[PDB]
Design an enzyme around this catalytic site. Structure first.
Site, short mmCIF file in Angstrom:
data_model
loop_
_atom_site.label_atom_id
_atom_site.label_comp_id
_atom_site.label_asym_id
_atom_site.label_seq_id
_atom_site.Cartn_x
_atom_site.Cartn_y
_atom_site.Cartn_z
N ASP A 162 0.79 -1.26 0.00
CA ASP A 162 0.00 0.00 0.00
C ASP A 162 0.81 1.30 0.00
O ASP A 162 0.23 2.41 0.21
CB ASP A 162 -1.01 -0.01 1.16
CG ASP A 162 -0.35 -0.09 2.52
OD1 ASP A 162 0.85 0.21 2.64
OD2 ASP A 162 -1.08 -0.40 3.49
N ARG A 176 0.95 6.78 0.03
CA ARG A 176 0.13 5.82 0.77
C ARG A 176 -1.29 5.79 0.17
O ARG A 176 -1.99 6.81 0.07
CB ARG A 176 0.14 6.20 2.26
CG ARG A 176 -0.70 5.30 3.21
CD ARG A 176 -0.20 3.86 3.26
NE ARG A 176 -0.80 3.07 4.35
CZ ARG A 176 -2.02 2.52 4.29
NH1 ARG A 176 -2.82 2.66 3.22
NH2 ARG A 176 -2.47 1.84 5.33
N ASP A 209 -5.62 -1.12 3.71
CA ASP A 209 -4.53 -1.61 4.56
C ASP A 209 -4.09 -2.97 4.04
O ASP A 209 -4.81 -3.95 4.14
CB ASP A 209 -4.95 -1.66 5.99
CG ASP A 209 -3.75 -1.79 6.98
OD1 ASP A 209 -2.68 -1.26 6.75
OD2 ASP A 209 -3.93 -2.43 8.01
N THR A 210 -2.94 -3.02 3.44
CA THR A 210 -2.26 -4.29 3.19
C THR A 210 -1.49 -4.81 4.40
O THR A 210 -1.03 -4.05 5.26
CB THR A 210 -1.31 -4.16 1.97
OG1 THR A 210 -0.38 -3.09 2.13
CG2 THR A 210 -2.09 -3.96 0.62
N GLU A 243 1.85 -5.94 6.31
CA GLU A 243 3.24 -5.57 6.21
C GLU A 243 3.94 -6.78 5.63
O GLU A 243 3.41 -7.88 5.69
CB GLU A 243 3.83 -5.18 7.56
CG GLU A 243 3.09 -4.05 8.30
CD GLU A 243 3.14 -2.72 7.57
OE1 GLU A 243 4.20 -2.43 7.00
OE2 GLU A 243 2.13 -1.96 7.64
N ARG A 272 3.73 11.37 3.65
CA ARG A 272 3.33 10.51 2.51
C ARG A 272 2.20 11.13 1.83
O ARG A 272 1.28 11.59 2.50
CB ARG A 272 2.96 9.09 2.98
CG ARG A 272 4.12 8.31 3.59
CD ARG A 272 3.79 6.94 4.08
NE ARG A 272 2.66 6.93 5.01
CZ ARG A 272 2.20 5.85 5.61
NH1 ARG A 272 2.69 4.63 5.33
NH2 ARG A 272 1.10 5.95 6.33
#
Ligand SMILES: Cc1cn([C@H]2C[C@H](OP(=O)(O)O)[C@@H](COP(=O)(O)O)O2)c(=O)[nH]c1=O
Ligand SMILES: [Ca+2]
Length: 129
Positions: A15, A29, A34-35, A37, A75
């Protein structure tokens, strides 16, 4: 909302990505997602998926929402498109990201992404298996 050009500098993970925007290098971002980690389950696949999407693309575009354009880490906060296809939506639809971080005023494409998530859950894909 409108699409603006950008060019890949470098894939980062599911992401985030480094793009050149208005001729400046920026980490972006992806809004509303939400991917995992990279060290988490489905992290590596999420990263691969986004990298492949960037690297196959002839044209990358970013689209700011109506709110904040930068987060607290500097970001850029955008929807990204690869050859007209939204990367944020494609991740959700494939069960490689969850709808997340929906803040009021930067949530234009919320319901589009929730619809994708409901289909990914239905199909039990990846995160939803
Ligand atoms: C997606 C997004 C994240 N963020 C911030 C909130 C989270 O703060 P914290 O770092 O304090 O948890 C963090 C999550 O991003 P990551 O999922 O990339 O870590 O980034 C925003 O402020 N606005 C946003 O639109
Ligand atoms: Ca993440």
């Amino acid at each position: 909302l409108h699409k603006e050009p950008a060019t890949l500098i470098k894939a980062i993970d599911g992401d985030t990505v480094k793009l050149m925007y208005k001729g400046q290098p920026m980490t972006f971002r992806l809004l509303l997602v939400d991917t995992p980690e990279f060290n988490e389950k489905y992290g590596p696949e999420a990263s691969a998926f986004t990298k492949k999407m960037h690297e196959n693309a002839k044209k990358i575009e970013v689209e700011f929402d109506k709110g904040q354009r930068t987060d607290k880490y500097g970001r850029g906060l955008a929807y990204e498109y690869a050859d007209g296809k939204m990367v944020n939506e494609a991740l959700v639809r494939q069960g490689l990201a969850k709808v997340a971080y929906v803040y009021k005023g930067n949530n234009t494409h919320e319901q589009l992404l929730r619809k994708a998530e409901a289909q990914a859950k239905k199909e039990k894909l990846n995160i939803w298996s």
